[PDB]
Design a protein around this ligand. Sequence first.
Ligand SMILES: O=C(O)c1c(CCCOc2cccc3ccccc23)c2cccc3c2n1CCC3
Length: 152
Amino acid sequence: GDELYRQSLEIISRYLREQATGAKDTKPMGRSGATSRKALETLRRVGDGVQRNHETAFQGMLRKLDIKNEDDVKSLSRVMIHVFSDGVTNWGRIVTLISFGAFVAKHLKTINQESCIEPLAESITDVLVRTKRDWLVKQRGWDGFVEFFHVE
Ligand SMILES: O=C(O)c1c(CCCOc2cccc3ccccc23)c2cccc3c2n1CCC3
């Protein structure tokens, strides 16, 4: 994964953590911090929108997932792939994946399984980067992500 993986994990982890706790993290970004911060801002905008519009579906999937513990979270990867790996690859679906990740994170905060949020992010990142790698590189990665949702 290297740089694309590191950057993906940092963005997804910060977004899920921020979404769960309502507090902004204060530590500096590794490399290309400018792009990670821009991607995070983009994610707050479009991701909060997708969580608002897909509330019914997100609730249904979360209920279906019956997440109660570290094992339940550790078990999600094949379900993520089950939905995500079928169909067309586009930024909207990637956003659906991450923003739903945030939704689950908020739910883990509710049941005091916040420790589970970091592996969840690690799991989402692994799913995204491993399965959609060539598509992401082709799209210029997170820079492409930002440019796709740039509101001029
Ligand atoms: O890939 C999609 O278009 C997609 C996605 C994104 C891919 C599947 O994402 C997940 C599926 C299962 C568990 C997940 C846990 C954390 C983050 C994402 C997870 C959806 C997520 C929740 C609900 C729906 C989702 N859809 C479409 C139908 C309704």
